[PDB]
């Protein structure tokens, strides 16, 4: 029965097309009813119907069945990133806690924002830099440390710039994540690396403190718009559901056929 | 006499041609009827309702506008060549023999500097 | 020999066409066509874009150069843009306007922002960037994010206990903070105690209004992974992942 | 759709009444076709984006 | 630095606008628009009014390009009805009703420019670098 | 228009109908259709649709009324206002402006000066959609309960057209052809 | 090779008169002549194969074998193409073309072979269609016309 079946979407695949048959297997054997029963489902039933677009829309420009098998593969092989081939939104009526990078964040507006990893940075190796005078790129092949600390200028302001990307977003509240980070691999030599980075050269003034100093330069900013508090770690409960009866729903019965049998024959027609 | 009836819809039209149609009678029974039309889809919904309305549409041409100018042009006027020489690829095909003819004249100074630079036939094709 | 062409392609064809004798004809052909130029979004400009509307609209008469932007927001150095260049632009001109009003966020963000970017000179260590305090806008002075408790206040740093930390550990330690806070939002949001208040209006807290922003993707996936963990589910706007890959 | 001249065509610098152009010809098929309705007429559009969400706005004879 | 007035911004020569973040740059770049296609501004106005073929908008991103153009078209609109009203209930629109003393020509030319808007000159940079190329490609040597 | 000398010999031409036989001018008034047109030679037209949208059948009416030897005949056949769609054809065909701006206090305040529009009235819709596959699925549902709806109502009488037809027509071919066997309408 | 003999075989085919009373194709002016004439015939009743055929059947001679064909009800339009229409002394006439003829290459091919070829491949009805189709046009096109 399933050979004799899959036949008939070979049939169905060769005559109709191929969101035809995509259609009637997700039709007779159900299977998008289970993807929306399960739970974390949904994702994947809307990158089966995108998935299947786009194998409808390379489909129809193909002649042969078999050239669009090898397209898939090809296209499963090559990981490169088009327009269209990119992951669409699961859902939009169900809200969700939408994660936006820094650069894809500009010119949005966002209520409240969460910024756990304002803290951490990262330290440039290479040396290309630019001229305080020419205004030119210098690309220095050689280790120099002027070049190194002139492009790690650079580094900490575009950090700066960053952090003033990121903080100007919000609406009614920001929250942020501060910690004594120390990029160097010594575990108490008496100094961290805050002010090597973008949050801690407006906290500590651009000096190099500890971690007592870091909190007292935190505190010392204290209004009734910037507060302080530590970070707990403790989880009691995930969350509550507060699930509703679904409203009933039935589908509309076609009374009259759409039209007749209406064609513009010929002769060879008839016979 | 030129007549331009102006109607808001093409059924009316549709009318006012049966109207003439059945009003006015071909002398010669096998000599076509010219119907002008935008497109072949048009001429096939103008071919229905022709049909609908006579019950036969039959001897009825439906040439485009540009082929019911050379067809006049060739019932009209006698010895005219089938092929123009003023062809699209006829003309490019001689521009390119005469572009590097004129490249020593004064007035074609601005293509010189576009085309003596570097050229492998590309710019001059 | 191709015959084909590029993205930066078209850039370096037209700087060489204006780096010609003629061309420079050419760019008074442009001042035929456009005699005035509103450029937006000056920070991410090229070298190359900048020599193009030097050349073309230096100091000709009856032309206009309207250059909109801002050096704060100049994030895209990866992609191809320099702040240096923004800087000769500043230097080559002579006048600059601000806006003074904002008409985003609230008087607290606002305040909070200006306490924190003005805390020394030239915060943003350019000389050729200077930080202006902005203000507030009179229509969105009552924009209140309350709790079940007191007014929450605009900007709050969370401050990780410790004395020194790795990179790992704290990236995993805030996620839960913040998995936290988002499920301490979400479970007091669905019962009218945290609220959007402006003026009179009210509004409950929806899981769309917090939005979390990180700078990579293996931290948004440790986001994503942590907040997933306490029944929240979370959507990705930045995944530019293709789905043959799944 | 609007189709940029070719920049050297004396057609684009001077026009006339009897002149091809892809943008009025679409503008007037648009009144042809809002006219031509007899009974219905059913407008779709795409007004937001799958992507991101985003707003997609109409042309402007809509 | 120096403040902004979008009616008070002299026209003339090179100037540099620096718009915070969160401020209304693409209102700001709307107003600027309106004032272009009016001729507003008394002496730090235009020399001569411009169609909407000579205004040139320059956006990187694409859909940047097509939200401002729909925000321009917006605020053409909005400002024809207040320049057939004369009132409105906006108080800049308010300041750029109470600058111009005829209304009639002002709406036809805001009328023109909700025609001409399909034909408006927003591009990206990259596009406009390209529609150069192929305008003008004696003098570039493009194919 | 061209010159004030053209627009009398225009207006000594008038349309006679076909099967009537009545002389039509080609003006709602004569007296003001020198106010009309500009001193530039282009008419102000009251409908904004047909003044933006019918440039090249302005053009095509003006190269049709330069002829010398033309004979023009009207055959309109005027349409009742009951429908949205029939007062829109109403107000181009009629040459008339029912665009409320509210030049006024008075026009401003009150609304009823409008046109009334039943919401029953399914004449013409605006559809916003997500996905082009989204939109040639919800132009197949309506077409459907437009089919159920009206039993006069033939499949040849009913035309869909694309602006961009490279780029939807496989979707609309994916799902047409997809229909079941109660469900499917010839394509 | 085929050319030679082609042509004397065209020019033997012109020279036969096809007619009761022998008229050639040659005696056919320009004006007189119609190749090739399209035709759209209406019909707004379903097409019943059983209520066609009897009635075919009624007054076509051809017609005492030939089991009938099963089509579904067609309402619409037909299209038809005749391959020729001419006029000769007032009187017109309608002539076809059949060439695939592979069974035969004696002289064979008589009365009864043809008419057993026409109850084959069916073209009674494709005739009787030409000749609605001419009825109707010369009806439409020549008032007080008689069949």
């Known amino acids: ?271 | 006499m030129l007549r331009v009836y102006h109607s808001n819809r093409l059924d009316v039209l549709e009318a006012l041609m049966e109207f003439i149609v059945e009003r006015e009678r071909l002398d010669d029974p096998f000599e076509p009827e010219m119907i002008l039309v935008q497109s072949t889809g048009m001429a096939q919904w103008l071919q229905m309702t022709l049909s609908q309305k006579f019950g036969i549409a039959a001897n009825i041409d439906f040439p485009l506008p540009a082929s019911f100018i050379w067809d006049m042009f060739v019932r009209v006027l006698p010895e005219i060549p089938k092929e123009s020489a003023f062809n699209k690829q006829s003309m490019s095909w001689k521009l390119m023999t005469l572009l590097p003819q004129l490249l020593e004249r004064e007035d074609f100074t601005l293509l010189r500097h576009y085309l003596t630079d570097d050229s492998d036939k590309r710019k001059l094709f | 020999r191709r015959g084909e062409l590029g993205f930066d392609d078209m850039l370096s064809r037209l700087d060489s066409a204006l780096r010609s004798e003629s061309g420079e004809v050419l760019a008074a052909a442009i001042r035929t066509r456009f005699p005035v130029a509103m450029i937006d979004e000056f920070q991410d400009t090229d070298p190359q874009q900048y020599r193009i509307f030097r050349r073309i609209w230096h100091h000709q008469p009856e032309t206009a150069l309207l250059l909109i932007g801002d050096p704060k927001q100049a994030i895209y150095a990866f992609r191809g843009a320099d702040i240096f260049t923004y800087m000769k632009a500043r230097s080559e001109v002579h006048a600059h306007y601000t806006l003074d009003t904002n008409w985003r966020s609230a008087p607290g963000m606002v305040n909070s922002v200006n306490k924190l970017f003005s805390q020394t000179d030239d915060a943003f260590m350019f000389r050729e960037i200077p930080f202006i305090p902005v203000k507030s806008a009179g229509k969105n002075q009552a924009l209140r994010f309350v709790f079940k408790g007191e007014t929450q206040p605009a900007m709050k740093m969370w401050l990780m206990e410790g004395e020194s930390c790795g990179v790992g550990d704290y990236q995993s330690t805030m996620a839960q903070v913040c998995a936290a806070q988002i499920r301490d939002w979400l479970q007091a949001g669905q019962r009218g105690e945290a609220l959007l208040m402006n003026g009179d209006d009210a509004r409950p807290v929806r899981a769309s209004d917090i939005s979390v922003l990180v700078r990579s993707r293996q931290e948004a996936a440790q986001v994503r992974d942590a907040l997933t963990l306490l029944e929240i589910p979370s959507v990705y706007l930045s995944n530019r992942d293709s789905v043959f890959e799944t | ?62 | ?143 | 228009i061209k010159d004030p000398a053209y627009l009398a010999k225009l207006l000594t031409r008038q349309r006679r109908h076909s099967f009537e036989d009545r002389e039509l001018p080609l003006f709602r008034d004569s007296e003001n259709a020198g106010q009309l047109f500009n001193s530039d030679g282009e008419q102000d037209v009251g409908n904004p649709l047909l003044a933006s949208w019918g440039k090249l059948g302005r053009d095509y009416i003006y190269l049709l009324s330069d002829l010398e030897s033309s004979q023009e005949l009207d055959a309109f056949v005027d349409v009742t206002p009951d429908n949205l769609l029939h007062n829109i054809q109403s107000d181009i065909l009629e040459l008339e402006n029912r665009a409320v701006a509210g030049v006024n206090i008075e026009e401003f305040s009150r609304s009823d000066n409008k046109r009334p529009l039943d919401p029953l009235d399914s004449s013409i819709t605006f559809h916003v959609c997500h996905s082009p596959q989204r939109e040639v699925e919800v132009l197949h549902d309506r077409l459907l309960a437009m089919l159920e709806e009206d039993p006069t109502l033939t499949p040849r009488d009913i035309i869909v057209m694309v602006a961009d037809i490279d780029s939807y027509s496989p979707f609309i071919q994916a799902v047409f052809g997809s229909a079941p066997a109660d469900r499917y309408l010839p394509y | ?147």
């Open chain 4, 1 to 62: 759709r609007q189709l940029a001249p070719l920049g050297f065509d004396l057609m684009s610098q001077k026009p006339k009444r009897g002149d091809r152009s892809r943008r009025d010809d679409d503008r007037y098929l648009f009144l042809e076709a809002l006219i031509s309705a007899q009974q219905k007429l059913y407008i779709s559009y795409i007004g937001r984006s799958i992507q991101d969400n985003s707003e997609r706005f109409p042309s402007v004879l809509v």
């Open chain 7, 1 to 147: 090779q085929w050319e030679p003999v082609l042509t004397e075989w065209i020019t033997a085919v012109l020279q036969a008169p096809l007619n009761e009373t022998g008229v050639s194709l040659s005696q056919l002016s320009a004006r007189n002549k119609q190749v090739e004439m399209e035709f759209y015939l209406p019909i707004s009743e379903p097409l019943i194969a059983s209520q066609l055929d009897t009635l075919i059947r009624q007054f076509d001679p051809l017609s005492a074998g030939c089991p009938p064909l099963e089509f579904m009800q067609v309402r619409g339009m037909l299209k038809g193409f005749i391959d020729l229409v001419f006029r000769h002394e007032g009187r017109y006439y309608l002539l076809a073309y059949k060439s695939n003829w592979l069974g035969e290459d004696s002289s064979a091919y008589t009365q009864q072979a043809m008419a057993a070829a026409m109850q084959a491949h069916r073209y009674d009805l494709q005739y009787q269609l030409y000749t609605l189709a001419l009825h109707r046009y010369l009806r439409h096109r020549i008032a007080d016309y008689d069949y």
């Open chain 1, 1 to 271: 029965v399933v050979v004799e079946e899959f036949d008939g979407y070979r049939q169905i695949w060769r005559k109709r097309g191929v969101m035809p048959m995509l259609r009637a297997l997700m039709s007779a054997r159900n299977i998008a009813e289970n993807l929306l029963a399960t739970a974390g489902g949904e994702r994947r039933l809307t990158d089966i119907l995108h998935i299947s677009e786009l194998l409808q829309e390379a489909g129809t420009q193909l002649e042969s069945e078999h050239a669009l098998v090898r397209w898939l593969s090809q296209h499963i092989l090559e990981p490169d990133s088009n327009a269209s081939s990119q992951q669409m939104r699961l859902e939009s009526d169900k809200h969700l806690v939408q994660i936006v990078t820094i650069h894809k964040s500009k010119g949005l507006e966002y209520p409240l924002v969460w910024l756990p990893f304002i803290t951490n940075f990262r330290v440039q190796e290479q040396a290309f830099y630019h001229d305080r005078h020419s205004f030119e790129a210098v690309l220095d092949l050689n280790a120099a440390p002027e070049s190194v600390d002139l492009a790690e200028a650079e580094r900490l302001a575009e950090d700066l710039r960053l952090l003033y990307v990121a903080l100007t977003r919000s609406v009614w509240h920001c929250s942020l994540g501060v910690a004594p980070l120390v990029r160097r691999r010594g575990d108490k030599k008496g100094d961290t690396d805050v002010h090597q980075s973008a949050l801690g050269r407006l906290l500590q003034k651009g000096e190099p403190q500890d971690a007592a100093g870091l909190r007292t330069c935190i505190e010392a900013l204290c209004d009734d718009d910037i507060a302080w508090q530590t970070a707990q770690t403790g989880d009691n409960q995930p969350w509550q559901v507060n699930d509703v009866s679904t409203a009933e729903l039935n589908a509309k019965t076609l009374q009259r056929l759409p039209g007749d049998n209406w064609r513009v024959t010929s002769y060879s027609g008839l016979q």
């Open chain 5, 1 to 143: 630095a120096e403040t902004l007035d979008p009616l008070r911004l002299p026209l003339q020569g090179e100037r540099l606008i620096e718009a915070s973040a969160g401020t209304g740059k693409t209102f700001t770049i709307a107003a600027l628009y309106l004032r272009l296609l009016l001729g507003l501004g008394g002496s730090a106005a235009f020399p001569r009014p411009l169609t909407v073929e000579e205004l040139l908008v320059v956006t990187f991103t694409e859909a940047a390009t097509a939200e401002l153009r729909g925000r321009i078209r917006s605020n053409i609109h909005e400002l024809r009805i207040a320049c057939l009203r004369e009132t409105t209930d906006n108080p800049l629109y308010e300041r750029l009703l109470e600058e111009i003393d005829d209304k009639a020509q002002a709406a036809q030319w805001l009328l023109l420019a909700e025609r001409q808007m399909d034909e408006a000159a927003v591009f990206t940079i990259h596009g406009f670098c390209q529609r150069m190329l192929n305008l003008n490609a004696f003098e570039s040597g493009m194919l």
